[PDB]
Scaffold this active site. Sequence first.
Site, short mmCIF file in Angstrom:
data_model
loop_
_atom_site.label_atom_id
_atom_site.label_comp_id
_atom_site.label_asym_id
_atom_site.label_seq_id
_atom_site.Cartn_x
_atom_site.Cartn_y
_atom_site.Cartn_z
N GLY B 9 0.86 -1.30 0.20
CA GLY B 9 -0.11 -0.16 0.06
C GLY B 9 0.73 1.62 -0.23
O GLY B 9 2.04 1.35 -0.47
N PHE B 13 4.75 8.24 5.38
CA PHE B 13 6.36 7.77 5.39
C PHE B 13 6.63 7.27 3.83
O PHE B 13 7.65 7.61 3.24
CB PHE B 13 6.64 6.92 6.53
CG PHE B 13 8.24 6.64 6.20
CD1 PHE B 13 8.90 7.87 6.87
CD2 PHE B 13 8.81 5.43 6.04
CE1 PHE B 13 10.42 7.21 6.86
CE2 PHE B 13 9.95 5.16 5.77
CZ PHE B 13 10.90 6.21 6.28
N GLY B 14 5.65 6.58 3.26
CA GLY B 14 5.73 6.25 2.06
C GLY B 14 5.21 5.17 1.84
O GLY B 14 4.14 4.63 2.56
N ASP B 96 -8.17 6.47 11.53
CA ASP B 96 -7.87 6.04 10.14
C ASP B 96 -8.80 4.63 9.96
O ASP B 96 -8.33 3.87 9.56
CB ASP B 96 -6.41 5.67 9.93
CG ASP B 96 -6.27 5.64 8.30
OD1 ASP B 96 -7.29 6.14 7.51
OD2 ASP B 96 -4.92 5.72 8.13
#
Lengths: 578, 578
Positions: B9, B13-14, B96
């Site tokens: 995914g 952060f990345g 989230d």
Amino acid sequence: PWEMRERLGTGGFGNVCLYQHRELDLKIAIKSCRLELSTKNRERWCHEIQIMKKLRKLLNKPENCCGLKESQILSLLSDIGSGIRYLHENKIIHRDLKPENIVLQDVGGKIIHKIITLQYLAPELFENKPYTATVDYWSFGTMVFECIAGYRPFLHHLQPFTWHEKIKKKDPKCIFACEEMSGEVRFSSHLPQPNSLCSLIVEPMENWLQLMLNWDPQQRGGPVDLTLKQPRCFVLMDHILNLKIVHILNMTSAKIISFLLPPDESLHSLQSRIERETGINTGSQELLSETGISLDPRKPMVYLFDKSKTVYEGPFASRSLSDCVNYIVQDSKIQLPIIQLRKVWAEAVHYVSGLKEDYSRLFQGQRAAMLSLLRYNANLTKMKNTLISASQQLKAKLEFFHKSIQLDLERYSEQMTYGISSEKMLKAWKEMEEKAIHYAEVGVIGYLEDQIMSLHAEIMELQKSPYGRRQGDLMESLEQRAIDLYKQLKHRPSDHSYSDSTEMVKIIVHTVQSQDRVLKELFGHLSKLLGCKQKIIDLLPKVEVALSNIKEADNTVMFMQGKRQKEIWHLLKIACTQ
Amino acid sequence: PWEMRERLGTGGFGNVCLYQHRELDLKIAIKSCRLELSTKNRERWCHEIQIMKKLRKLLNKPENCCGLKESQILSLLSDIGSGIRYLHENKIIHRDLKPENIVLQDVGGKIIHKIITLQYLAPELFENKPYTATVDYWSFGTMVFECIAGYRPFLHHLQPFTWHEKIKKKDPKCIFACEEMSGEVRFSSHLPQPNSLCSLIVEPMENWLQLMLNWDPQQRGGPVDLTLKQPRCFVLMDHILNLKIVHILNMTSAKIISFLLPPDESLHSLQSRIERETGINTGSQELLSETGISLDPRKPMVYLFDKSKTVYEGPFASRSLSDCVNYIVQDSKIQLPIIQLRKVWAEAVHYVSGLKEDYSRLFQGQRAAMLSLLRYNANLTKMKNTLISASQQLKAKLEFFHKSIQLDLERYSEQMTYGISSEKMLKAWKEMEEKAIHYAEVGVIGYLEDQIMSLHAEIMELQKSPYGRRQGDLMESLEQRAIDLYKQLKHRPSDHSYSDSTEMVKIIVHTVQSQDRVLKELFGHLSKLLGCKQKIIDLLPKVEVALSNIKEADNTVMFMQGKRQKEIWHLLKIACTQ
């Protein structure tokens, strides 16, 4: 209240119309007047009314174009042979022998044939010569040869204006002429090889063809025995049409061997004959019916089993091809005339249908062997019920017996306590009790019962077996495609002279692949069937002897108790004495 | 010695890349660095490392777009409910919550869910307000409602910039908003009707939705019981997630009725409850397992049988459609927007799949009833073997007994000839013999044995029955085509606004035709099964009482023979006296 059903045929007086009354099925063939016949031949036509009141369609079937079956040709010899014997008794010469003059009557399968074009025209008729019954002999052996060839006995598709001139040049001891593609006229005193017949009758039928097709009419059927008002032709027909031949497929080698039967040979000497033929010992030689019933040795197509051999290998059925067919195996795409092609492709579909009947008969022998296995299973269930029943009878007699003698030893011991009894019958009855306790066969019936349920489980597993006839109908589809390609060849005119035959060779490929598959599966089936069969056969005398021992201890124990009775009667009368 | 398996995914952060070592299956998700994150949030990222080390795909399946199963939603309440309880113990607010953050772990079927877009963004998060766990409550009941709707709980596909402004205008006691095709904003305090849930838990889940989706955060999950550190929400989750409900398909009426179970009700009082529910008397009310085992009355989806009713008619399974679907039944060819079409066609495939599970469960009850029939058959074979065995035991004891007393009357008659015997025991023993000959129960065992082989033949015939699951896979093909048409609708962009739906209505036609066919064949099966079952049940006490009579004459006759013994001992001691 009826109409014309269908125009049957034609004739010199006119066309023939078959009638039917749909409410009553009033079938009758009526030769109508279409030709406006002259009154002389009209009077001769009513003469033909007073005398008559006093098949080629089946030949042109693509299956039949190879040649007919054995029993079909035999029954044709019976119906038409007997018919022309009857006609030659009635001083009748038809002059019109052809399969177009053969009516087929299906009586429950019995195809009764009755009597009602230049290749059937005799050369003496072709040039209008003095005639006799040997003309109809010539057409007879002509047509009967065409029943196995699928074509005329002499130079097929040659124009009779010179074809009869070639008939005048025939070697009379020879029977068949073949012409090569270069036009090479050769003769043969032998049958052409793609038949469906057994040689044992073919060679007297070969000499029969040597008599029936000599173009000298005084020689054609010439040696007429006035002892029996027949030629040697009808002598051989009388022999062959009663000549008993048992055909036997060797199931172990996939081979059918025919056998002449002397009119009084026992089945055991027949087993000696097959024994000398095949090497299979008569103790291991096993034979049984088409319906799966073992052949009575007390009596004089059955199927050969080897008892001493367990696992049967692959087939030893050599299935040859001709060098024309092998030439197609080399290259199917050579563009050759249809004179070859109809013959060779007929040999191909002939070959495939032969393979179909091979698997069909092997399928029959498998089913029949399974039926024999069922009969053995049935006897196994009968001896099962007898064993369980009489065994528990023995057990109950044991229980009642020893409880009885237990009471008898209690009271008898009380009389020895009273100073009455003797110790000798005491110890003897204790030995009776000990031997009764020794009779412990109730475990053996459970163990061999477990063998019974073992084999019963095995044969129930053999019930659910898959069948290769699944691919047998695949062979029916392949053969059907081959018939369709033969038909598509057959309806071609001469403009379609050159053709390819590759897909038929592919049908040969998938044919022999599927045949190998169903033979492997089939031999696996029969292998397990004969294995479990052997297990049953080995199981039987154990059950039998054990049951015999049950009857032994039965009558033994009953005699022992009655002995105990009589001894008590002895002490009774001794006490009556004192 | 391994590589990147698949990019899992994304993240702040990345991107996340799931790894695997093919030689060792070293699965790990590693969030890589793609965003070049600021060092403040990099330190917060390693904080997230210390804290973390301290489903939407399945939703978009066209089967699942209707809504999820019962036990799936329940297990979701267990995993995610328990998980957020654990997180609220750890003072954690994820912010989230989404099915994209739900990992599915298949442990042998147990789908363990773990924790790792503006419609899940809370309106307080949408305007960046002070937050708490009721935010994650809002997203929780949001997502769980989406598990049964297939869509968001409020004005589906509305842009959140004003959709949250409509959220500010929600009736808090209402739970669901629907919008008409004219734009009519209405509210509902009820569930939308195409669910897959039972109302008995839906209404506490309805009030649970009244708590979990109030847009006031101090009221959303507000009544927090500090007795148990939970809102009334988690109270109802604790109740419902342990709320035992037995679901029972009435096989006789094709109806499933759910039932709340008090924690100590016996099965008999349950039979009183179903008795009051259905009218079926408990003596005729028959229940048995999913695997076909009859329910123990001694204990506290099983299938309902009526013993007193023999032939069962057609189904009383009313299977309704919506007025949109009925409007398609009126005309499938009306060219209407896809906002309707995806919903209505989802209801259609929903309906068909419901029919498939109907036939599936009926197929189960048929198989289970056949299993019960097999168990009854097994007891019938046991009593068979007992009957044949002990019966022939009785027969042998009869034979041995009367032959014994025949010898005893011969010798006893010889002693009456000697002036010794008395006639009273003579006549008495002749009465013993006569009553022994009266014991002629060996025909009754053959007759009722013929009843045994009769019913055994019947159940062997019932083994070979054809199955409607042949058309069940046809229903699988029809439903599969309906899924394909739903997919072809689903991948259409907005340029394909108008469509036809006739072939789906044809699938409804052939669906209900085939369903009527398999219900007719099925009810024929079950009818014959319960018939022969009744024959077995009626057959049993005959065999039992007859076998009891066998034991009666057994102990009777053995007592009679021992009596004869003791009498001979009396004449013995009398002769010893004289």
